[PDB]
């Protein structure tokens, strides 16, 4: 990795990561059929078979109540949580597309006994129809012949325990769907077996290395996905699931963090904060900015950002991470009369810009408190120290190794006078701050 610490804006930039951009959504429809259990009844008294059959009956009956929908500039705040909203909007839209009686009858006659039976919709979307039929095979070969004149208290408990381990999948999936009201936050191991997930991955329409990265990083792909109920038709329960489609792979990405620099003289403060912290990635020559943190996640040397919440910017923004003094691009900052002891956390190291009022120092696990921190915009690396302590709050540093560089520069806070410093502002460009200073002095 590469870490660069800019003194003149009190910022850190971390580059050298590798891109994974979640861009597409693959709709995947599953069905599981149960049979004529509605005409199967236990009337010979209590039994384990009777209780598990009643559990299956109650589960499939309460599954019907869930019927989808309602059961039948500040860049950070603008994009706050919009990716999840867009994802669930696309999910409920494609769910409304596939919740048609002609469509489900067509998909049932199309699937027959061929497992993957890929089909199309009215507007036309790949869906990858798949049925799982192990419980139908069990009930057709064993259970109907086992039941006779509603005698469910048979001596063969092997049939009972095999029915338990078979219907545990259906009971599990309906229990997540009851717990999450049809909108699951993630994918459990019961919704996707590894073979089914691999089959869905191999049929995802994308290139070779895209499929490779889909394969060896499947666990948090399962974390990213989510499944939506469709309904019960005939004896078949049909649901779907959205799989992420990673389209943009192996591009450098960087993350920028900052803390306010406060010029101080004679009890006079002037603090400035860069407001463009977050992720930046490249694709097809264009720059995509992710200001939120929940949308994007690191793993190893790779990053996983969502293009739905991202915004499109130009290349010149990079030049205000290097040459903020002489830049033409007016990238955003914020102004203040008071310092804030908010701590910056680089992926490799850390930064603390604590000021008068609190105490700051560093510590190591093996030895103890190493040294105190002088007041100012201070940077620290995991090589020099293990933990950073401000007053009574302790923060840990990750031990991911890399190489670092510090750009020497006079802080841009010191070029202004706190006397002529303007009122507090939110998300205004640095040239706007300079011209506000010029207007207030004039």
């Amino acid at each position: 990795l590469k870490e660069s610490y800019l003194e003149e804006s009190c910022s850190t930039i971390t580059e050298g990561y590798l891109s994974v951009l979640r861009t597409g959504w693959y709709t995947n429809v599953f069905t599981l059929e149960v049979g004529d259990v509605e005409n199967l009844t236990c009337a010979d008294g209590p039994s384990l078979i009777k209780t598990e059959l009643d559990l299956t009956k109650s589960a499939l009956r309460e599954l019907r109540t869930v019927s989808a929908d309602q059961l039948a500039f500040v860049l950070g705040a603008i994009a706050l949580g919009v990716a999840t909203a867009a994802a669930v909007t696309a999910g409920v839209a494609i769910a409304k597309t596939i919740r048609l009686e002609s469509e489900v009858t067509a998909i049932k006659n199309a699937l027959k006994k061929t497992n993957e039976a890929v089909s199309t919709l009215g507007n036309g979307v790949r869906v990858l129809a798949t049925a799982v039929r192990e419980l139908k095979d069990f009930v057709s070969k064993n259970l109907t012949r086992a039941i006779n004149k509603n005698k469910c208290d048979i001596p063969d408990l092997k049939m009972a325990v095999s029915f338990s381990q078979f219907n545990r999948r259906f009971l599990n999936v309906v229990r997540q769907f009851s717990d999450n009201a049809g909108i699951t936050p993630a994918i459990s191991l019961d919704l996707m077996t590894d073979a089914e997930l691999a089959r869905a991955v191999s049929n995802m329409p994308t290139s070779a290395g895209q499929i490779k990265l889909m394969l060896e990083n499947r666990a948090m792909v399962r974390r990213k996905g989510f499944g939506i109920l469709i309904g019960v038709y005939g004896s078949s329960v049909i649901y779907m699931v959205q799989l992420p489609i990673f389209g943009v792979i192996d591009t450098p990405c960087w993350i920028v963090k900052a803390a306010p620099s406060c010029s101080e003289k004679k009890g006079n403060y002037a603090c400035l904060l860069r407001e463009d912290q977050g992720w930046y990635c490249q694709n097809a020559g264009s720059t995509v900015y992710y200001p939120n943190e929940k949308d994007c996640e690191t793993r190893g040397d790779h990053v996983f950002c969502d293009t739905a919440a991202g915004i499109n910017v130009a290349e010149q923004s990079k030049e205000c991470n290097i040459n903020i003094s002489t830049t033409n691009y007016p990238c955003k900052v914020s102004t203040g009369r008071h310092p804030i002891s908010m701590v910056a956390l680089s992926p490799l190291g850390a930064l603390v810009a604590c000021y008068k009022g609190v105490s700051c120092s560093i510590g190591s696990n093996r030895v103890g408190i190493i040294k105190q921190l002088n007041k100012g915009c201070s940077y620290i690396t995991n090589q020099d120290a293990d933990t950073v302590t401000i007053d009574n709050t302790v923060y840990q540093l990750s031990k991911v190794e890399g190489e670092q560089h510090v750009i020497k520069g006079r802080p841009v806070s010191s070029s202004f006078d706190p006397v002529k410093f303007p009122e507090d502002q939110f998300n205004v460009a640095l040239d706007q701050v300079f011209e506000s200073i010029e207007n207030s002095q004039a």
Partner: antibody
Framework: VQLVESGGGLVKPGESLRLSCAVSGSMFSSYVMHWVRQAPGKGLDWVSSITGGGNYISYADSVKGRFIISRDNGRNSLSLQMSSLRVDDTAVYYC???????????????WGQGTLVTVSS | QSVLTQPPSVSGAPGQRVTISCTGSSSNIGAGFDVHWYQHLPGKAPKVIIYENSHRPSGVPDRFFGSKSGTSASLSISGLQPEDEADYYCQSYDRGLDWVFGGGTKLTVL
């Protein structure tokens, strides 16, 4: 955006040569890149795909194993080692950029002039 | 030996419509993705002529129209001024881990 490459000529069957490609874009590491070939009098045929930095490559089945691909983003250069030849590889080679769409699909565009390579005898 | 098949036997008078048919199989095209077409005049490096089956880039006249449907892709060319004499090629992403092109088709104007 223009681009150039060189490294071919009259080559006996079997030996390994280097094809160096010197594309000069605005910024380099964003683009997947590809090599394609043009046999004289036949149709075009895809040779190789390489993504941004050196980890996810693939080849055509006819040229699997016999070809090595790499790229230096710092030098802004592209490198191919070509080895273990048989005579039907006589063709003109093209470096192509990978300006992608809204998905994993991409189309070749802004093609190079090409470099001619002869293999037989 | 290209799996993408298209007839290399098209020519005619200037002005009228000429149609190119490019057809594969379900693994070739299907409905997941698309076909991109490239033109190649002799004496110069070939350039892309249409991508995403409709998106004309900068520097191409609107005489060129393309479509895809089912597994079959159709080119319609009208207003043949003599300079549009070239070879035409398809591309596809069939799942045999290979980026297969088409068979190539010559187009000349009498």
């Amino acid at each position: 955006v223009q681009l150039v490459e060189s490294g071919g000529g009259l080559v006996k069957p079997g030996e390994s040569l280097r094809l160096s490609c010197a594309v000069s874009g605005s910024m380099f590491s964003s683009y997947v890149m590809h090599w394609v070939r043009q046999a004289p009098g036949k149709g075009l045929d895809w040779v190789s795909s390489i993504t941004g930095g050196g980890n996810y490559i693939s080849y055509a089945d006819s040229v699997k194993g016999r070809f090595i691909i790499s790229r230096d983003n710092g030098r802004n250069s592209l490198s191919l080692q070509m080895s273990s030849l048989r005579v039907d590889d006589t063709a003109v080679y093209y470096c192509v950029r990978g300006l992608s769409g809204v998905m994993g699909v991409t189309w070749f565009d802004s093609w190079g002039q090409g470099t001619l390579v002869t293999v037989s005898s | 030996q290209s799996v993408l098949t298209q007839p290399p036997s098209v020519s005619g008078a200037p002005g009228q419509r000429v149609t190119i048919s490019c057809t594969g199989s379900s693994s070739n095209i299907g409905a997941g993705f698309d076909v991109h077409w490239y033109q190649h005049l002799p004496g110069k490096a070939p350039k892309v002529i249409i991508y995403e089956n409709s998106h004309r880039p900068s520097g191409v006249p609107d005489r060129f129209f393309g479509s895809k449907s089912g597994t079959s892709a159709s080119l319609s060319i009208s207003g043949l001024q003599p300079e549009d004499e070239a070879d035409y090629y398809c591309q596809s992403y069939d799942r045999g881990l290979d980026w297969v092109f088409g068979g190539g088709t010559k187009l000349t104007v009498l």
